Amino acid sequence: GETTDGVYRVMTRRLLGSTQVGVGVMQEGVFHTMWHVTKGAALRSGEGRLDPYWGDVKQDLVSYCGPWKLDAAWDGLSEVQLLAVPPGERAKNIQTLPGIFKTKDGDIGAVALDYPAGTSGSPILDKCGRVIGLYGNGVVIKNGSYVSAITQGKR
Amino acid sequence: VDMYIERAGDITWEKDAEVTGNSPRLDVALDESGDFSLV
């Protein structure tokens, strides 16, 4: 039961308090998060250990226990929901129409929502509840607000 | 360092939700270390 489906906080502790460094998705026995959350290191889940399996620093993604399982794609048209899991706050659904990161290799959906750094890895959902990507790799625009790519791996 | 995970909820679409944020159209580049930058 250390890999039951759901969204999870990623925490670190030393000798004192804990810090939320990110968020991830457990699906089909595999944990999915952003590379900058864990730096690709192993995770504890209760009494168990989750070992890194696949990852890519350029995509800023890592999976644990098996290959990347999340395959749903933004349809380029519809509103989406960020299931934001900020440090010290309950999970909340935020609906938005993505903008676009236009790159030399193609377009990527992008959400203009601002949260603390430890919200990295929060899942972005389509209307069927499928995870179409993870929040937290993006840019800061002129006024200081944030735009996150909808970062999705290849299944 | 103890890096560990804690369950935080079910993954479910919320019917009738607050729709918010704008939809910016940005030109960006992605480098080999995973950093996005404005172009």
């Binding site: 952003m34 900058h36 601002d114 949260y115 603390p116 750094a117 430890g118 919200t119 990295s120 937290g136 790799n137 993006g138 840019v139 800061v140 944030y146 | 950093d35 996005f36």
Partner: peptide, 4 residues
């Protein structure tokens, strides 16, 4: 971002 409270870019990451």
């Amino acid at each position: 971002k409270x870019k990451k």
